[PDB]
């Protein structure tokens, strides 16, 4: 099976092999740092360990995991500018835990000029949708991935709750499907949808209890190993 | 119970809640990144996150943490020098994971910069004795830590394993016991020890396991709850 979006550097090697065992075998870890930097190199760091250490902590347990590299809403360093010079070096697998938050402009440029050079990278994203603002906030995102005209492949919107299923819909974006609750099974009406646990630093198995509660069988085969297709694996 | 040398940011919240249930409800978390820094800020930022957000993590699983702050010599940044600057202002509980490995010039600098500073500050440090050369670095580190005349209430050395229990002896720090075997009870020959689990990112209950074996009982509440003396508090 496979469970994108979980934060590696929350889990301990113990709640890792619980993943080995139960059929989450690959994960697509993103980067986040749960305190705002004081410094943008910091970030850096912070993926040198998640791209040279968390994949080794993760194999040795039984787990494929496919790091993610970004700049959190939430943990937006001054010079943001710094963080992006070092991406647009080194080769990625895909931009981790993107997006908007508070709508404020300083995400807004944070969460464009990744976006934007995503683009440039042919490089998918992770976009993050809030839980407050989770449909005024998701229609910026979804306003801002618009005018870039991202194509409809390269970016994915998650924790897409029940109450905005349609919003994402009317587009042509991934949408993330998020258990965390596990009544989204039944969101199956239609198929662009990815199972996903969001195992944070707060339990960590939604990405198969209902990735198997769906009843359709077979054809599920594209919630839990259709995120394979989205990250080219 | 208490378990000094325990690294929190290797740790999940599960794994955390089984140290609540198990008596370890009371642990001393320290610094050290996976991999060595890029630039000497990022200690900064991994300290924030320390002392800001993981004593709350801890608690809200049922542990008192007491972060420990410092600069590990696997992971000694370039300019060192801006690490002690931030350290030398925000006043701290105790300095964690600091020592010698390879026995180069550039940690006994890193080690005694630091070690020197503490004795400016009257702050308690954990010094860590490499696995490796376990004898020919212990001897190093306590020639360097008699040199600046550190108070024997001030530096707890760690992993003390049992081949090297009589040259730490020979001095008037405190031992600290790491349990990871189990045949340390034995050790209690004497009382300047520490039960100590080092529950790091690689299980995590070792801190009582033999913090019981000690059929000595009663007495044992100055080898579990003896660190509070060290760490005052
Ligand atoms: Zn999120
Ligand atoms: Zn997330
Ligand atoms: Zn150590
Ligand atoms: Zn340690």
New interface residues.
């Given amino acids: 099976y496979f469970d994108s979006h979980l934060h590696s550097?929350?889990?301990?090697?113990?709640?890792?092999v619980?993943l080995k065992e139960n059929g989450i075998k690959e994960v697509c870890s993103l980067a986040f740092?749960?305190?705002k930097?004081?410094?943008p190199?910091?970030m850096?760091?912070?993926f040198?360990?998640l791209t040279?250490?968390e994949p080794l902590?993760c194999e040795?347990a039984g787990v494929k995991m496919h790091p993610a590299v970004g700049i959190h809403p939430r943990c937006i360093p001054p010079d943001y500018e710094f963080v992006l010079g070092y991406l647009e070096e080194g080769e990625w697998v895909a931009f981790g835990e993107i997006g908007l938050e508070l709508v404020t402009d300083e995400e807004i440029e944070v969460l464009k000029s990744q976006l934007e050079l995503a683009k440039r990278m042919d490089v998918p994203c992770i976009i993050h949708t809030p839980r407050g603002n989770k449909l005024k906030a998701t229609r910026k995102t979804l306003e801002i991935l618009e005018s870039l005209d991202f194509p409809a492949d390269l970016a994915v919107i998650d924790h897409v709750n029940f109450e905005t299923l349609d919003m994402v819909l009317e587009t042509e974006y991934w949408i993330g499907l998020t258990v965390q609750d596990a009544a989204r099974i039944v969101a199956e009406h239609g198929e662009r949808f990815m199972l996903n646990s969001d195992a944070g630093?707060?339990?960590?198995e939604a990405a198969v209890k209902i990735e198997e509660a769906v009843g359709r069988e077979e054809m599920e085969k594209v919630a839990r190993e259709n995120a394979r297709k989205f990250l080219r694996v």
Avoid: H, M, N
Avoid at 9 to 16: A, K, P, Q, T
Avoid at 201 to 204: D, E, G, K, N, P
């Fill in positions: 550097e929350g889990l301990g090697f113990s709640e890792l619980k740092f749960p305190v930097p004081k410094y190199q910091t850096i760091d912070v040198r360990k040279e250490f902590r040795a630093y707060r339990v960590a």
